[PDB]
Write a protein that binds this ligand. Structure first.
Ligand SMILES: [K+]
Ligand SMILES: [K+]
Ligand SMILES: [K+]
Ligand SMILES: [K+]
Ligand SMILES: [K+]
Ligand SMILES: [K+]
Ligand SMILES: [K+]
Ligand SMILES: [Mg+2]
Ligand SMILES: [Mg+2]
Ligand SMILES: [Mg+2]
Ligand SMILES: [Mg+2]
Ligand SMILES: [Zn+2]
Lengths: 65, 220, 226, 128, 119, 119, 101
RNA sequence: UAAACGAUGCCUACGCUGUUGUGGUUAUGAGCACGGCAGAAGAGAAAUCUAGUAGGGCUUUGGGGAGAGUACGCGCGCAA
């Protein structure tokens, strides 16, 4: 439904109006370092983006994984 | 740890000759995490190699995620860094913009010839400020090469590298091109074609090209 | 007599082909940049009301040059509302202009219960505040069967949004109709996005529909060309 | 000097707005401990450590994504059980969730436990 | 493309007691739909009270200056008598270019430059 | 007060960008080319255009005009850009480098043939 | 409304400063506010140096210079055109002027 | 008594970055006290920011223009 989108980095809902929200998709590495059909997916709000804070935060979470 | 395509000794050497690691004198709270010491003689900050390889790998990964590669838009509005974009985009199937980025050209339907982006790439993003600003209206991520003096709000992936020297610009673009091709299986090893490509991308004056023409013709 | 719509934008291609629904649009926070997109789904149902007409003036060597400024609301009495202003030489032209702005700024409005979850949801979920210029508005949930305790302009807006009971308070220069209209629309909007205790568990994830349908759109690229 | 229970609240409110996950709080008293321990029972904060520095005291805490706001009331008004719902309606956003904390002869308790135990007390603070 | 017809459509609607705005808007649609590349309409008089005014409308392309005005531009003027006084109507239309010379001039304007495409 | 103007200048640039292979230094040649390649009706305008074309041609020839694209020059540029120097700094296996870099090498045990810059 | 962030003067962290007198009209002006101008002028004009070369008794001669610091009040500086009115964004630009001769 | 003005009360908090000063101290990496400057984010009717966040403590003080900081009484002062 219309009310089920939540930001991964700031843990609050994203409103339908936010032009600066974006979704980031990345592939997963294969054995011997090649590519695969499976995707990482992140939903990120505009508030982090206006500040500049997203650069470091994403680097943290790829390490967490 | 992050799963990254392995470093190889000649590649490492290559970047060091290309002077990728020489930052400026200033630094920013966003970029402290990439520096590893300062030159006692010069006050120049030195960039961490292992981190540079990491974010280069991370960029490559997400370039692979978007079908119909034409929808990737590469921009770089400066000579001294021009031809790199023109070749790089062809190596992956992307579209490009070369001169002044006409403001409104993503926003406004009437301005022809530039596609609605799904991913924007920028080099030396002190110029091309408009491009980073405008992509924000159309829900596109942004990837930029950047240096310790400068800082950006909307850039999602900041690849750290020298951006103020023609040696350096060539190195970043040349390597990243190869990774994207490798990740897809278009090539079998990355050390294959170093001095050929890295030179092709490197910027040269008209005055040099005259000399090289005359030399080449004498050799022919 | 009528003109057929050719979609100017990528999302526009999907709606005309019939590959998408209006909840999916709002759910993924996609931009709307063609009014026809809203017409396609809601044309049969939209009501509108003009909140204010006023005359504005610019002084020149020759005299005052003058124009008509109109502000209105579009809404469906169920879920959707949007607010729009336009300026033109003529009151008709101004209405045409205002409607474009309204359609490009429609939003879905959530609802809730004053007490227990018996029957249908009828009020705003949570007490919230909206600010525009010198004007501040606060909305509070209300028991079923109280009706709309609301001032002149804001009352129309709650009705179009499909709210049945509310309590309202207000501060500032409410004579300025544009500020009072925008502030009240922000108040309900802010209430819908409040971080409810359940929200973290209700979370779902999906790939963006424009990336999901890339194959079809690539066929449409070649079909237009050939 | 600032009130210690006021200082606690502003420290966590600002850090939450700035999107930090953890903070150090610099001056701690007996009721500050009990307040934090209340927020842990209802799952608003996750991890607590106390540092025994011989200089007043200090705490390190992990914040959850569920915390929107908290605050202290000054002064600490006395309330009969008849009065508490008035304060509940003034402070909290909804009838469905959130906590108003009251000190009593039975420790810190919330506005629901007041009905169960049949006791008023003194008003202390709130969170949602 | 005949301004003398359209002006009499306008004059009729005044006697039919229909607002000038609606009447003029209709006239402009008819002129444009029939292929005119632009037109000008002015109404003048005791139109909305005791103080007289004139209201002028422009659409598309209209030429005012030089010899190109004598070959592309067509004009008509009329007036309607009402209980309060005479209301005057001016209509001007710019004809389309026409390679067979029926609807307008064969040769396009003297100042237009066109460069041919390459093989 | 003899300024070509925006119509004349636009037309002239389109002509040089597409017919450079047909033009020369001479006004009288250049006028025969524009009489063929363009639809200019006014006698005064075709003289203005042909005069403007000669001036552009001599600029493009005597080291360049920016923001003007000539196809056969793009061909020359590409063939020139398609070259690698004999001289290189990539193939020398030995290197001298800063002291901090030696400590960065030490912290990651990097294999090679690095030496301190003598300075 | 407040036109300048620094109130048009260079005083900060002080109560009071010494006054000086305007070169053109002798008005009192605070030292931290006065418009200042530096001059280094040859005693002998450029149009005479070619005569000096035949007039002097010495093998070589260096002309003596004269040195001045001048102070002006706002009204005089504007009227003599040492300074001019500037737009709302230009007002913020600060650059050192040339030494006069 | 002053346009006694940074027209911004006093203690005490929580708070982003870069740069430049003054005085001590230094594992030479930096700190502590007192400043200037330039952005950001929030805020505000805007201009702008001693103005961000907040039921921390205590004092002064305003309530549409005028008449009026004037009349009568009182206290200080040689008078003003
Ligand atoms: K007249
Ligand atoms: K003073
Ligand atoms: K000054
Ligand atoms: K006073
Ligand atoms: K001080
Ligand atoms: K204020
Ligand atoms: K008195
Ligand atoms: Mg003309
Ligand atoms: Mg003034
Ligand atoms: Mg005091
Ligand atoms: Mg009063
Ligand atoms: Zn003076």
């Amino acid at each position: 439904n219309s009310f089920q989108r939540v930001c991964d980095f700031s843990l609050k809902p994203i409103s339908s109006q936010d032009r600066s929200s974006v979704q980031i998709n990345m592939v997963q590495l294969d054995e011997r370092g090649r590519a695969t059909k499976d995707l990482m997916i992140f939903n990120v709000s505009g508030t982090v983006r206006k500040n500049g804070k997203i650069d470091s935060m994403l680097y943290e979470r790829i390490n967490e994984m | 740890a992050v799963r990254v395509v392995p470093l190889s000794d000649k590649v490492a050497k290559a970047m060091v000759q290309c002077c990728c690691h020489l930052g400026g004198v200033t630094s920013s709270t966003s970029l402290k995490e990439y520096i590893f010491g300062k030159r006692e003689e010069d006050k120049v900050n030195i960039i961490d190699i292992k981190k540079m390889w990491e974010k280069l790998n991370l960029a490559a990964r997400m370039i692979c995620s978007i079908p119909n590669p034409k929808d990737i838009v590469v921009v770089s509005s400066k000579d001294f860094g021009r031809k790199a974009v023109i070749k790089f985009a062809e190596s992956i199937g992307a579209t490009a913009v070369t001169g002044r980025f006409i403001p409104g050209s993503f926003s406004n339907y009437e301005i022809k010839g530039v596609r609605e982006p799904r991913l924007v790439l920028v080099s030396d993003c002190f110029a091309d400020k408009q491009v980073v600003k405008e992509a924000s209206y159309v829900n596109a991520p942004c990837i930029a090469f950047c240096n310790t003096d400068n800082d950006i709000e909307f850039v999602d992936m900041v690849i750290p590298m020298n951006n103020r020297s023609q040696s350096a610009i060539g190195a970043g673009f040349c390597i990243l091109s190869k990774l994207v091709n490798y990740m897809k299986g278009n090539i079998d090893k990355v050390e294959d074609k170093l001095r050929d490509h890295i030179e092709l991308y490197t910027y040269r004056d008209s005055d040099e090209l005259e000399q090289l023409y005359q030399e080449q013709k004498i050799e022919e | 007599e009528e003109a057929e719509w050719f979609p100017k934008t990528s999302l526009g291609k999907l709606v005309k082909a019939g590959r998408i629904t209006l909840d999916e649009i709002f759910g993924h926070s996609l931009c709307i940049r063609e009014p026809e997109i809203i017409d396609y789904f809601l044309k049969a149902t939209l009501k509108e009301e003009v909140l204010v007409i006023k005359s504005v003036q610019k002084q020149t060597k020759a005299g005052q040059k003058t124009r008509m400024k109109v502000v209105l609301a579009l809404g469906d009495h169920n879920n959707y509302i949007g607010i729009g202003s336009g300026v033109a030489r003529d009151v008709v032209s101004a209405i045409n202009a205002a409607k474009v702005v309204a359609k490009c700024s429609m939003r879905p409005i959530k609802k809730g219960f004053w007490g227990n979850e018996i029957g249908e949801a009828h009020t705003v979920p949570v007490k919230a505040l909206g600010k525009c210029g010198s004007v501040k508005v606060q909305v509070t949930p209300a028991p079923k069967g109280t009706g709309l305790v609301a001032g002149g302009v804001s009352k129309t807006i709650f009705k179009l949004a499909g709210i049945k009971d509310i309590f309202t308070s207000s501060k500032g220069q409410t004579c300025t109709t544009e500020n009072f209209a925008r502030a009240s629309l922000y108040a309900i909007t802010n209430s819908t996005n409040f971080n409810m205790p359940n929200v973290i568990e209700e979370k779902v994830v999906e790939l963006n529909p424009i990336l999901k349908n890339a194959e079809f759109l690539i066929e449409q690229e070649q079909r237009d060309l050939r | 000097m600032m009130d210690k229970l006021a200082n606690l609240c502003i420290t966590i409110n600002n850090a939450n707005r700035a999107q930090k996950r953890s903070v150090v709080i610099r001056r701690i008293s007996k009721v500050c401990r009990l307040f934090l321990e209340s927020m842990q029972k209802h799952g608003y904060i996750t991890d607590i450590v106390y540092i025994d520095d011989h200089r007043e005291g200090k705490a390190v805490v992990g914040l959850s994504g569920r915390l929107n706001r908290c605050g202290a009331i000054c002064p600490r008004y006395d309330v009969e059980l008849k009065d508490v719902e008035r304060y509940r309606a003034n402070l909290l956003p909804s009838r469905g969730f959130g906590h108003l904390i009251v000190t009593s002869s039975k420790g810190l308790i919330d506005h629901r436990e007041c009905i169960q135990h049949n006791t008023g007390g003194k008003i202390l603070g709130y969170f949602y | 493309l005949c301004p003398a017809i359209q002006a009499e459509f306008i004059r009729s609607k005044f006697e039919e007691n229909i607002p000038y705005r609606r009447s003029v808007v209709s006239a402009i649609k008819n002129i444009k739909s029939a292929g005119g590349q632009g037109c000008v309409i002015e109404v003048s008089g005791k139109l909305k009270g005791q103080r007289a005014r004139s209201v002028k409308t422009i659409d598309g392309k209209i030429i005012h200056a030089g010899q190109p005005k004598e070959e592309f531009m067509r004009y008509a003027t009329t007036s309607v008598l009402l209980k309060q006084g005479i209301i005057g109507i001016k209509v001007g239309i710019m004809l389309p270019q026409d390679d067979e010379g029926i609807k307008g001039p064969v040769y396009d304007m003297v100042d237009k430059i066109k460069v041919l495409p390459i093989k | 007060g003899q300024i070509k103007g925006k119509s004349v200048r636009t037309a002239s640039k389109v002509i040089v960008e597409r017919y450079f292979n047909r033009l020369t230094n001479d006004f009288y040649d250049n006028r025969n080319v524009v009489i063929d390649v363009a639809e200019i009706r006014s006698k005064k305008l075709r003289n203005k255009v042909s005069g403007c074309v000669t001036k552009l041609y001599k600029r493009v020839k005597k080291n360049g005009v920016p923001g003007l694209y000539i196809k056969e020059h793009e061909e020359e540029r590409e063939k020139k850009e398609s070259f690698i120097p004999k001289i290189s700094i990539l193939d020398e296996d030995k290197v001298e480098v800063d002291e901090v870099t030696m400590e960065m090498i030490n912290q990651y045990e990097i294999n090679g043939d690095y030496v301190l810059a003598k300075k | 409304t407040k036109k300048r962030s620094n109130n048009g003067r260079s005083k900060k962290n002080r109560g009071h400063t010494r006054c000086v007198r305007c070169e053109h009209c002798s008005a009192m002006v605070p030292n931290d506010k006065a418009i200042k101008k530096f001059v280094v002028r040859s005693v002998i004009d450029a149009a005479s140096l070619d005569d000096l070369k035949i007039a002097t008794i010495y093998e070589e001669y260096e002309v003596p210079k004269s040195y001045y610091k001048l102070n002006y009040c706002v009204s005089c500086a504007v009227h003599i055109k040492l300074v001019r009115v500037r737009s709302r964004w230009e007002r913020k630009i600060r650059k050192e002027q040339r030494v006069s001769a």
